[PDB]
């Protein structure tokens, strides 16, 4: 009957949302297994870099799937699906409907998460080659050590990314180089203490300061690195609460499917 092709219609509108945001949580998965990696201290920044590459694809398939699931040209999972009602009843009104359906667009998945962060250019690092000895920086009381003395003010960004983080999972502070904006960012749960004998944001990024960094709020994984150790740790806990989201999306498109095929029957 037409009462029972609309709600088959509802059915399949449903196992579409439910098949791809499964494809989603699996890719989710992907990227907590790599965020799991990047937490493992013993790893290089290039060792990161590259997890962070593989990363982007992943948030890149997640996003193009958020941004193209449909059903009969309706988008299901770019948070414009505001529910559906299906006439089923003899009367005008008798209808059941499928609820609305999350975003899980990579910018919305996991909510919201505030940090501390700061961010520099690579530009202000005029003294890229006043090399840095041992105890020259110190992250929250930890020195990084020695860097040479660089050739470009890339370099020393690089040099400071790199020394930042071997410490990261003592300190709790992260460092994070987006070579598109020429930008190193520093993140933590809390003010970052800056301190040592260079006492010169122009050779080491960041001069003495012991409340560096400004509180940040994001939304989404995005945003979010495995460039560091802390970095990998955001990561794993948004997806957690992303991962959580999923799953009740798909618990709830598992009972209207179930609600559907029973109205059918």
Same mark, same amino acid.
């Given at each position: 009957?037409?009462?029972?092709?609309?709600?088959?219609?509802?059915?399949?509108?449903?196992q579409t949302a439910e098949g791809a945001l499964g494809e989603i949580?699996?890719?989710?998965?992907?990227?907590?297994?790599?965020?799991? $990696?990047?937490?493992?201290?013993?790893?290089?920044?290039?060792?990161?870099?590259?997890?962070?590459?593989? %990363?982007?694809?992943? $948030?890149?398939?997640?996003?193009?799937?958020?941004?193209?699931?449909?059903?009969?040209?309706?988008?299901?999972?770019?948070?414009?699906?505001?529910?559906?009602?299906?006439?089923?009843?003899?009367?005008?009104?008798?209808?059941?409907?499928?609820?609305?359906?999350?975003?899980?667009?990579?910018?919305?998945?996991?909510?919201?998460?505030?940090?501390?962060?700061? @961010?520099?250019?690579? @530009?202000?690092?005029?003294?890229?080659?006043?090399?840095?000895?041992?105890?020259?920086?110190?992250?929250?009381? %930890?020195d990084v050590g020695k860097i040479d003395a660089a050739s470009t003010?890339?370099?020393?960004?690089?040099?400071?990314?790199?020394?930042?983080?071997?410490?990261?999972?003592?300190?709790? %502070?992260?460092?994070?180089?987006?070579?598109?904006?020429?930008?190193?960012?520093? @993140?933590?749960?809390?003010?970052?203490?800056?301190?040592?004998?260079?006492?010169?944001?122009?050779?080491?990024?960041?001069?003495?300061?012991?409340?560096?960094? @400004?509180?940040?709020?994001?939304?989404?994984?995005?945003?979010?690195?495995?460039?560091?150790?802390?970095?990998?740790?955001?990561?794993?806990?948004?997806?957690?609460?992303?991962?959580?989201?999923?799953?009740?999306?798909?618990?709830?498109?598992?009972?209207? $499917?179930?609600?559907?095929?029973?109205?059918?029957?």
């Amino acid at each position: 009957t037409q009462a029972q092709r609309n709600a088959n219609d509802g059915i399949s509108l449903a196992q579409t949302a439910e098949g791809a945001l499964g494809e989603i949580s699996n890719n989710l998965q992907r990227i907590r297994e790599l965020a799991v $990696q990047a937490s493992n201290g013993t790893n290089t920044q290039t060792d990161r870099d590259a997890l962070q590459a593989e %990363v982007t694809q992943l $948030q890149s398939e997640i996003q193009r799937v958020a941004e193209q699931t449909s059903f009969n040209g309706q988008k299901l999972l770019d948070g414009s699906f505001n529910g559906v009602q299906f006439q089923i009843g003899a009367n005008a009104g008798e209808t059941i409907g499928v609820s609305k359906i999350m975003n899980a667009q990579t910018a919305s998945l996991g909510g919201s998460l505030t940090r501390t962060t700061s @961010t520099i250019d690579a @530009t202000d690092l005029t003294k890229y080659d006043t090399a840095m000895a041992a105890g020259d920086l110190t992250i929250n009381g %930890v020195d990084v050590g020695k860097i040479d003395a660089a050739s470009t003010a890339q370099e020393r960004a690089a040099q400071l990314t790199e020394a930042i983080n071997r410490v990261s999972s003592q300190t709790n %502070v992260g460092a994070s180089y987006d070579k598109t904006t020429g930008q190193v960012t520093l @993140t933590s749960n809390a003010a970052i203490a800056v301190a040592g004998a260079a006492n010169d944001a122009t050779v080491a990024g960041w001069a003495n300061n012991a409340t560096t960094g @400004t509180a940040t709020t994001t939304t989404g994984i995005n945003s979010l690195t495995v460039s560091s150790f802390t970095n990998a740790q955001q990561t794993i806990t948004q997806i957690d609460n992303a991962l959580k989201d999923i799953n009740t999306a798909r618990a709830d498109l598992g009972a209207v $499917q179930n609600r559907f095929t029973s109205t059918v029957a």
